[PDB]
């Protein structure tokens, strides 16, 4: 198996960290984890889209 992102679920920027809640391909919601942005830099455009969308939804 590999670390395959199926869907970005949520995002928080607190505690000196930028974290994304991710849904893993081949796994269920019981396996959702929060991962640092540094470790997801290979999906930079997916993260950028989620950053803008969650910024507009919060506003």
């Amino acid at each position, epitope marked *: 198996d590999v*670390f395959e992102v199926e869907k970005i679920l949520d995002m928080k920027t607190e505690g000196g960290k930028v974290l994304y809640k991710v849904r893993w391909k081949g796994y269920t919601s019981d396996d959702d*984890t929060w*991962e*640092p942005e*540094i*470790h997801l*830099e*290979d999906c930079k455009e997916v993260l950028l889209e989620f950053r803008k969308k969650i910024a507009e939804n919060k506003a």
Partner: nanobody
Amino acid sequence: QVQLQENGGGLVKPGGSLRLSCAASGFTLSDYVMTWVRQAPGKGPEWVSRISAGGSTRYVDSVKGRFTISRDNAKNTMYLQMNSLKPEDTAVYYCARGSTLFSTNWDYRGQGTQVMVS
């Protein structure tokens, strides 16, 4: 300074068990993607299991259902529980500190510990 030291190896009969540890200092394990790697004599390096900063784990297919990776955040130590060991599991096992979920590339690795199944 960043340090990684492995232990727990040794000689074990086929079907036995070993619990490897990877003690870290100079950094926090939960801030990195940690990987167990092994290299048998005469073969190339191959990753065995990884644990994400968030605690998500994945195993190579040849060890699925036999190996279990975990980390004690209060110890800053990573563990690799090896059950139902086979002669093909003979290798030097070493932990590696990565920062990418999609590559196993690392910056720091330990010196490794020997596992001999015989």
